[PDB]
């Protein structure tokens, strides 16, 4: 079937951001009421997905879906995360060949844009 993911946190948020900042495409700017989907294909040489993310001043909705290759599976349901006080991270086991959809939901914010610091991984 489909394996449950693990999700955790850690306090080194200023450290994390400084490493990520150095990369151009590892920092997204989600606008007012915006929803930025990040399509992360399964690596043919991989069996697990990992993710790290954070923001600077405000929270943001975050969840993860899985697209089979339009059949979807809700890996992590989209709820708001306090990724501005601690670094949010998690892992999940590939169920097959597909594309992970990392949702950064801001639809609920009428005035504030969110500066997302993120990075994705994989393990053999």
């Amino acid at each position: 079937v489909i394996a449950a993911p693990s999700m955790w946190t850690r306090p080194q948020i200023k450290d994390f951001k400084e490493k990520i900042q150095q990369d151009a495409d590892s920092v997204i700017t989600v606008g007012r009421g915006e929803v930025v989907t990040v399509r992360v294909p399964t690596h043919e040489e991989g069996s697990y997905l990992f993710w790290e993310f954070a923001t600077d001043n405000y929270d943001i909705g975050f969840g993860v879906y899985f697209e089979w290759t339009p059949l979807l599976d809700e890996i992590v349901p989209v709820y708001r995360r306090d990724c501005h006080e601690e670094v949010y991270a998690g892992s999940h086991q590939y169920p097959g060949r597909g594309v992970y959809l990392l949702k950064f939901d801001n639809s609920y914010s009428l005035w504030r844009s969110k500066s997302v610091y993120y990075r994705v991984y994989y393990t053999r």
């Binding site: 449950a4 993911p5 693990s6 999700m7 955790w8 946190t9 850690r10 306090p11 080194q12 490493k19 495409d25 997204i28 009421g33 915006e34 929803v35 930025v36 989907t37 990040v38 399509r39 992360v40 294909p41 399964t42 690596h43 991989g46 997905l49 990992f50 992590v76 349901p77 709820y79 708001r80 995360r81 949010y88 991270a89 998690g90 639809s107 990075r119 994705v120 991984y121 994989y122 393990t123």
Partner: protein, 34 residues
Amino acid sequence: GNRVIDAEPREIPLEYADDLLEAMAHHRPVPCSL
């Protein structure tokens, strides 16, 4: 209220290994569902 980005999964750097030790030392599980 929508935008799609494409990103390849990177590989865990060997440099950030001491970063995984502090993680496990401080990793505090959170619920996936609230």
